[PDB]
Design an enzyme around this catalytic site. Structure first.
Site, PDB file in Angstrom:
ATOM      1  N   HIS A 182       0.841  -1.217   0.000  1.00  0.00           N
ATOM      2  CA  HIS A 182       0.000   0.000   0.000  1.00  0.00           C
ATOM      3  C   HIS A 182       0.867   1.256   0.000  1.00  0.00           C
ATOM      4  O   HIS A 182       0.353   2.352  -0.139  1.00  0.00           O
ATOM      5  CB  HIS A 182      -0.999  -0.048   1.119  1.00  0.00           C
ATOM      6  CG  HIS A 182      -0.543   0.399   2.478  1.00  0.00           C
ATOM      7  ND1 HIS A 182      -0.125  -0.462   3.471  1.00  0.00           N
ATOM      8  CD2 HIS A 182      -0.449   1.643   3.001  1.00  0.00           C
ATOM      9  CE1 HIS A 182       0.203   0.243   4.549  1.00  0.00           C
ATOM     10  NE2 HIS A 182       0.011   1.503   4.290  1.00  0.00           N
ATOM     11  N   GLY A 229       2.267   6.733   8.786  1.00  0.00           N
ATOM     12  CA  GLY A 229       3.649   7.094   8.481  1.00  0.00           C
ATOM     13  C   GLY A 229       4.663   6.025   8.834  1.00  0.00           C
ATOM     14  O   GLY A 229       5.800   6.103   8.366  1.00  0.00           O
ATOM     15  N   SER A 236       3.890   2.846   8.099  1.00  0.00           N
ATOM     16  CA  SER A 236       3.528   1.817   7.151  1.00  0.00           C
ATOM     17  C   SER A 236       4.741   1.405   6.336  1.00  0.00           C
ATOM     18  O   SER A 236       5.527   2.251   5.894  1.00  0.00           O
ATOM     19  CB  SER A 236       2.475   2.261   6.163  1.00  0.00           C
ATOM     20  OG  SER A 236       1.208   2.354   6.817  1.00  0.00           O
ATOM     21  N   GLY A 237       4.842   0.121   6.093  1.00  0.00           N
ATOM     22  CA  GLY A 237       5.931  -0.440   5.331  1.00  0.00           C
ATOM     23  C   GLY A 237       7.159  -0.782   6.149  1.00  0.00           C
ATOM     24  O   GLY A 237       8.027  -1.512   5.662  1.00  0.00           O
ATOM     25  N   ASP A 280      -0.072  -7.560   1.731  1.00  0.00           N
ATOM     26  CA  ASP A 280       0.448  -6.198   1.744  1.00  0.00           C
ATOM     27  C   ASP A 280       1.983  -6.208   1.861  1.00  0.00           C
ATOM     28  O   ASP A 280       2.554  -5.906   2.907  1.00  0.00           O
ATOM     29  CB  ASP A 280      -0.184  -5.368   2.840  1.00  0.00           C
ATOM     30  CG  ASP A 280       0.082  -3.884   2.733  1.00  0.00           C
ATOM     31  OD1 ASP A 280       0.559  -3.417   1.689  1.00  0.00           O
ATOM     32  OD2 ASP A 280      -0.180  -3.186   3.761  1.00  0.00           O
TER      33      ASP A 280
HETATM   34  N1  LIG Z   1      -2.712   1.663  14.079  1.00  0.00           N
HETATM   35  C1  LIG Z   1      -1.914   1.161  13.173  1.00  0.00           C
HETATM   36  N2  LIG Z   1      -1.091   0.148  13.636  1.00  0.00           N
HETATM   37  C2  LIG Z   1      -1.881   1.539  11.747  1.00  0.00           C
HETATM   38  C3  LIG Z   1      -0.727   1.337  10.927  1.00  0.00           C
HETATM   39  C4  LIG Z   1      -0.715   1.724   9.578  1.00  0.00           C
HETATM   40  C5  LIG Z   1      -1.834   2.342   8.957  1.00  0.00           C
HETATM   41  C6  LIG Z   1      -2.999   2.529   9.756  1.00  0.00           C
HETATM   42  O1  LIG Z   1      -4.170   2.995   9.171  1.00  0.00           O
HETATM   43  C7  LIG Z   1      -4.486   3.070   7.711  1.00  0.00           C
HETATM   44  C8  LIG Z   1      -5.854   3.825   7.470  1.00  0.00           C
HETATM   45  O2  LIG Z   1      -6.297   3.329   6.164  1.00  0.00           O
HETATM   46  C9  LIG Z   1      -5.754   2.014   5.954  1.00  0.00           C
HETATM   47  C10 LIG Z   1      -4.837   1.651   7.132  1.00  0.00           C
HETATM   48  O3  LIG Z   1      -5.644   0.923   8.101  1.00  0.00           O
HETATM   49  C11 LIG Z   1      -7.038   0.784   7.603  1.00  0.00           C
HETATM   50  C12 LIG Z   1      -6.940   1.006   6.074  1.00  0.00           C
HETATM   51  O4  LIG Z   1      -6.608  -0.226   5.333  1.00  0.00           O
HETATM   52  C13 LIG Z   1      -7.441  -1.318   5.411  1.00  0.00           C
HETATM   53  C14 LIG Z   1      -6.828  -2.592   5.496  1.00  0.00           C
HETATM   54  C15 LIG Z   1      -7.557  -3.790   5.577  1.00  0.00           C
HETATM   55  C16 LIG Z   1      -8.958  -3.679   5.566  1.00  0.00           C
HETATM   56  C17 LIG Z   1      -9.565  -2.424   5.373  1.00  0.00           C
HETATM   57  C18 LIG Z   1     -11.062  -2.295   5.498  1.00  0.00           C
HETATM   58  N3  LIG Z   1     -11.566  -1.249   6.111  1.00  0.00           N
HETATM   59  N4  LIG Z   1     -11.828  -3.289   4.945  1.00  0.00           N
HETATM   60  C19 LIG Z   1      -8.837  -1.177   5.477  1.00  0.00           C
HETATM   61  C20 LIG Z   1      -2.999   2.187  11.152  1.00  0.00           C
END
Ligand SMILES: N=C(N)c1cccc(O[C@H]2CO[C@H]3[C@@H]2OC[C@H]3Oc2cccc(C(=N)N)c2)c1
Ligand SMILES: [Ca+2]
Length: 223
Positions: free
Chosen positions: A40, A175, A177-178, A84
């Site tokens: 992502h 931030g 992420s990855g 991912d």
């Molecule tokens: N709290 C955390 N550990 C964290 C870490 C990285 C990113 C994050 O939030 C972002 C917000 O948008 C992205 C990522 O987290 C949620 C969404 O991705 C998904 C992933 C899987 C399922 C779906 C869904 N709603 N069906 C969404 C938080």
């Protein structure tokens, strides 16, 4: 990283910053020519920044190297974040040293309760917003699959695991992420997703790297 601590400069030498004019994601160096990150985090025009502590100050141990190729997992699903994971090849090999070092891939998956180190330059507040310039670190255990799947019914696949604290207070965040989740010297997770940051009963969700080691090794050997 919410509820963590300042790592100390270059104490996480496999941590990279992905930069497209600005930091936007972490990654992990797995050999002198390749980085693993989250799918992502894909975008074109990536510069990999190695040796970083303060991402806003040139401190003397950085290497900035353009990506030559990015390879998103063949089965990545952006709606669910299943699979991912992405590979990034460096246009030139990094010069490996004590501040710029690879992290080993797992030979087997890690078990629930194992303690891991999670790091990044993401938001440090659970309400509101504050981005650090130096690297932040968090020690966090792998949670049972049942606790993971209870927090996110319907959304956890065998390619994901949860880590952190059900009480809240301590998590990765936007931030981060990855970036890496390292447990017992092996890259076991990639910062993937969650609900808010550091909320009660909503632990972080991480890509389960042990399921991808064959793909990683075969991909890098053929590219
Ligand atoms: N709290 C955390 N550990 C964290 C870490 C990285 C990113 C994050 O939030 C972002 C917000 O948008 C992205 C990522 O987290 C949620 C969404 O991705 C998904 C992933 C899987 C399922 C779906 C869904 N709603 N069906 C969404 C938080
Ligand atoms: Ca710097």
């Amino acid at each position: 990283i919410v509820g963590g601590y300042t790592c100390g400069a270059n104490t996480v030498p496999y941590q990279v910053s992905l930069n497209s004019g600005y930091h936007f994601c972490g990654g992990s160096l797995i050999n002198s020519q390749w980085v693993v990150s989250a799918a992502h985090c894909y975008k074109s025009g990536i510069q990999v920044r190695l040796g970083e502590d303060n991402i806003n100050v040139v401190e003397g141990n950085e290497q900035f190297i353009s990506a030559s190729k990015s390879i998103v997992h063949p089965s990545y699903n952006s709606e669910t974040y299943n699979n991912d994971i992405m590979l990034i090849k460096l246009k030139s090999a990094a010069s490996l040293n004590s501040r710029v070092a690879s992290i080993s891939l797992p030979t087997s998956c890690a078990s629930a309760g194992t303690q891991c180190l999670i790091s990044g330059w993401g938001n440090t507040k659970s309400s509101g917003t504050s981005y650090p310039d130096v690297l932040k670190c968090l020690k966090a255990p792998i949670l049972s699959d049942s606790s993971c799947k209870s927090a996110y019914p319907g959304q956890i696949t065998s390619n994901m695991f949860c880590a952190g604290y059900l009480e809240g207070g301590k998590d990765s965040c936007q931030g981060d992420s990855g970036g890496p989740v390292v447990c017992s010297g092996k890259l076991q997770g990639i910062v993937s997703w969650g609900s808010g940051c550091a909320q009660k009963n909503k632990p972080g969700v991480y890509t389960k790297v042990c399921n991808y080691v064959s793909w990683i090794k075969q991909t890098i050997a053929s590219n």
